[model samples]
Target chain A: SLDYQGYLIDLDGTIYLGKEPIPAGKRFVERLQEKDLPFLFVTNNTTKSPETVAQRLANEFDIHVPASLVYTATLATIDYMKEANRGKKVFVIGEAGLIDLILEAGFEWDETNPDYVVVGLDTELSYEKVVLATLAIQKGALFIGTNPDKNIPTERGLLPGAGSVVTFVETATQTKPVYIGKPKAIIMERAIAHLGVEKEQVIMVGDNYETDIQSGIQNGIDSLLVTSGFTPKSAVPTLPTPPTYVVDSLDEWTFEG
Target chain B: SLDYQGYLIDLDGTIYLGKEPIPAGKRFVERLQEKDLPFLFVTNNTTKSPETVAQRLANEFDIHVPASLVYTATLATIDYMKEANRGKKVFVIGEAGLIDLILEAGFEWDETNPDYVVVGLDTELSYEKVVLATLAIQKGALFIGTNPDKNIPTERGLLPGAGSVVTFVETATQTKPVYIGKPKAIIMERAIAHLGVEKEQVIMVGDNYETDIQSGIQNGIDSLLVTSGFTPKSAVPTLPTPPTYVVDSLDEWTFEG
Candidate 1:
């Protein structure tokens, strides 16, 4: 039983950060459990597996969430690429998590002379990897990036993310990339598929406008923006599309009609 | 006679802003006359006549400078366009200042169906003009931009410059422009020719590193970076080419051996 009718939630800066749960995060989940509602965690960060992410959330927040409710960008990326590429050999500049997702999608992964170059946030980024990716892209390989966010927030400060690497490759090749993460419809579609609900019926919640509100707008879903994370009040006016509702934090939000 | 043995001055920010003199501008002229040294005002702004610019500076700054001492991007742009198009008609998207320069360069101006679209800083930009420029560029007209600086500082905050208009045309037509300003060698070559000195003997001075210092490096010339306006000291280390000298202002410089 959940307090919300239909739910689409983000993970980073929303539910938990690293290994700690946000304030009132547990209470929010307890309230959701008190009333029967269906929810899906739609995440744009593709560096983790769905099961791993779900387990992490459950372990960190003491929430009994199912792995099936977790819809990750990795899933969306693989599904979208499979349809777009039609089983083309891909050169991957990403992590083991992304590689696993690609292999699971039943696509061939080629290191040399690939038809497409798929990039994501690799914890082990190096000059050699960047050179290989640039060479592959220069050789007419179709370039795709997980997202365009230059940095991701950490407890200390912002750190370089997948988008930073993508920028370097794009600048070198003078080519634009097809993004398959937050703000795009790919992740939202995966979330809708996993939740088994129409997008109109779901109330999406996130902290970032570019990723969360943009995703909601692109996928035809309602979004409630909370200023508890990466997004500040100063950035509200610059949003291309407005969210359905805005709140200081999730504490003020109520799923009950 | 200027105090400096060789004067390498900037045009836009250092000279005049929208036909107005900067503070303590008379000191610039008095120093030049007192020293009796040779100098040239090298500018990237291609929209105005050198004679007109020299007159403006003389009148506003109360200086005695000749039009021949002013070398601008217009001269280089004309040379490049003449080499490429020979006798092609150009559609200008700028103010009367730019139009006058283009006409002086011996190119025919055609509004209906132009062979090339020349873009520059226009204080008087209109939507209709943008529409016409878009139509011209889309109809296979070669696109050219004087510079790519987004904002020009004013008594008011930064205002949109030629680069803003160029962005619209570039986005609409999906065409990259051939730049003929600072950061490129087009105008620098003209400056070199006017100076009658080898690239090694001449020095370029400006406030922008990407356009001024980088252009000097591209043309095999020394550069003196000034901190009076645009491109502050904080951005020095990140530049592709380090300036030969970094000064707080041109007032501190003396060419006396």
Candidate 2:
């Protein structure tokens, strides 16, 4: 068993499902804390700020983590833009959490003429916003999607996610967007840099084969697949690129120093 | 030369461009009227009532036609639902034009559960409506799109059309919609029935090759391509299936009884 020096963890499936926290998943976080191992809950949720996410974890999931330890796709998007050294004028189609963070990063808001158009999950999305995005992209603005999630699993059911909204504009403008979230190199690279750890010593841990496992596989990192959430134990062997480790639950994973 | 017994014409590109009337197109309609030829404007636009469309043609384009002579995708959708003999509960994501007609046809409004979810272009489109449609479609409601136009040409630019909105729900639900509009046999068949014309004697006329010409080609109707609008004169030879007749202007065609 390899003792990875650091960890990049997913939230929804690994830590909890909906409003309920998995007990074994909470114990895994506690074990990491006791061993003083560096770990970050890397989430693709752009609807909630890192502070809000950390607070949610503390209040509902019984996991105590600082806001600094939570890295979201919203933060990664800002990182991506800053690194690319592009113009700061942006038109965004997203919730307040996503819009506020981008504005706070010193990017100015422009509805008519923007250098980039960022799209994410917005429960309050409207056609006027879509029109603005379509027109801007037609006039040479770069398009960026925070994540490529097609549907967000909700109590109501699976609803249209960020990618679906992005697709609307893509279809209108006939242009593809640059995605900056799990399974994409842009988010993984930034997450690795935020951890300040070498890729070889860090393992990506989650319960999704498409986003979590594929994130590590495509980005040159080891991955641990937990079957406690989305993916099942029966389907592990048939995965095109199998994870480095597969466990039925977080309790099955052994700690090493 | 074949003198068609009935005509099915496209609106936007064939008769007018935006708010401006094509003089030759107006003269063509007059010629049809003089000869007492049976003709109906088959349009995919679901954002306007047939009355509104007829009034626009009379007031702006100098073409007189009753609302009954204008066959819209909205009307076609109603015809489709009536023929399918499905449930009467419908949830729509479209403008007043589409909603009013559907409701007038005796279909009840439903947000939570519906027999059909019809999506079309709406300037007032919002995320709430999208969420409602997504939930219903996920619950096994039939999905119907009024048209497949990616963009609607406007002075502002090509804006996101009904197809893009339908694509959003299609992505979330992971199901294809049954489209009822130009280029689809459902609308064409209903339009033919309304005209009371035989398929062999009817000729479809339009400027757009994709929607207008394909509608006739795929449905076993003859098509007359006019280069006055969307599809230019230079692209006719390269067309996969040639139209029954191609003309630079409607003035070039000689009418026969």
Candidate 3:
């Protein structure tokens, strides 16, 4: 492939298929590892613990990656918060993974008069939670959404995701959230900084065009779109803008290693 | 006076300010009663039952109105639903008044493959409710919103209103609902039908321009804006499309009946 120094890769569909694990993806990661290339698996799934994700990659998928090699929007959120405002009270609305990272970063939770209101995917969301977030923003709290994915694919069907929760707060308070995941420049900048690489030296790789490809395009980073998931090869010709590189699968690409 | 035969009057600000009675409002209603004019007290509040609303108007505000005189967006929803599709399975997300009325209107409840998904001001709303409504809509259920009100004036503050709930469902489903309250012609149409009046002979009156006056303006009906509530007389000078008439209180109108 292209001679890129660092990589920002997607999880789920890009690396594995619903716990089945794509064989070609594992081999590709092994190739990068053999060549000692720098790659960070960037995921919008903020609900996961890095320990579990790292374990899943290593034991289940045979990708075998360390915790540092895996990055999530959860990590990016804490990074964003640390840079924007530290020691300020924050009201977080998400599950364990998101909450854990923010707590680890030394942020305290306060409902009223909080400096920030951070929102992410919460399976246990309620009207009161939405009210609190809206009221907090109305009280002048900074609103932050981890990711902007509207729908998440599951066996049950496309259910409401983080963006839906964000939409609730946005509509109630009538203010736009500062989104920090894919398709947003904040997450890309944060991920690039996390990788300790120059902007030109990093390449974004994913399967979805809307979030993954547009993320790279908007951030001025070279992107590789793999057709192994989400986007079909038939649909690429009709795209308003195309990704930097397109591969039917990672197996077709020749790595510089 | 434009000599209108029937009237659709707004409650709350026009009739009473919270629990405090507006003496002028009661006197005006007495004038209408003595003159034998027909009027319905319309409201977007789907929380209180009409029986309780009428009882409050009579016992608390000295306005001896019958239950038939009270009309809420909850009633409008059933009216619109019955006219559009009677006996359809509906998945409802609201409190007692909204749920009870829809059930009373011979509609069946079905979460899966529902004919319609109705949403309203749900103070007790939960994330699971939002998820279910979204999933049903995505599965091809018709989406319905009781009112488009963005905020409900409460002593606590302008908390998230029915419109906020609707926005949540709308965002999650990625589909706009067919709103059935003021600012939409459907509610006015249904309310007029209940009053059994011709379009030209009916008058719409309220304290809010966005809901009441706009309802009249868009429906091609005459409207009187009373300054006894949320709207101010100062706003009249700035309104691009002014109400047909403006009064500080209904006591000033001197209705014939």
- For candidate 3, the TM-score of chain A alone versus the native chain A is 0.95
* Interface DockQ of candidate 3: 0.01
Q: What is the DockQ score, from 0 to 1, of model 1?
A: 0.01
Write model 2 residue lDDT over A1-257, tens digit each, in one string.
Answer: 25688899999988988888889899999998988888888989887889999999999888899999999999989876665445789999999989999999989999997877899988898999899998887776768888887888788987998889989888987876778898776688668878887777898999998889878755557889998877788888666436777888878887662
Each prediction's whole-model lDDT (CA): 0.71, 0.84, 0.80
**In candidate 3 chain A, where is summed lDDT lowest over 10 consecutive residues?**
A79-88
Question: What is the C-alpha lDDT profile of model 1 across B41-115, one tens digit per residue?
Answer: 887776568888777777767777889888877777777776453237989877787777788767888876687
The per-residue C-alpha lDDT of model 1 at residue B106 equals 77
Off by over 4 Å in 2: A1-257
DockQ (Cα-based) for each candidate? 0.01, 0.01, 0.01
Q: Write the per-residue lDDT of candidate 1 for residues A1-257, one digit (tens) a residue.
A: 24336788887878776667777655666677676667778876777887887777767677777777788777877776654432477888888888888877777777776767888888788888878878877766667888777888876788998889889888877776767777655566567777777754677888877678756644446788887777887776644334778887788888754
Worst 10 residues of 3 chain B by lDDT: B78-87
What are the clashing pairs of model 2?
none
**What does candidate 3's lDDT look like per residue over A20-43, in tens digits?**
777778877988889888888888
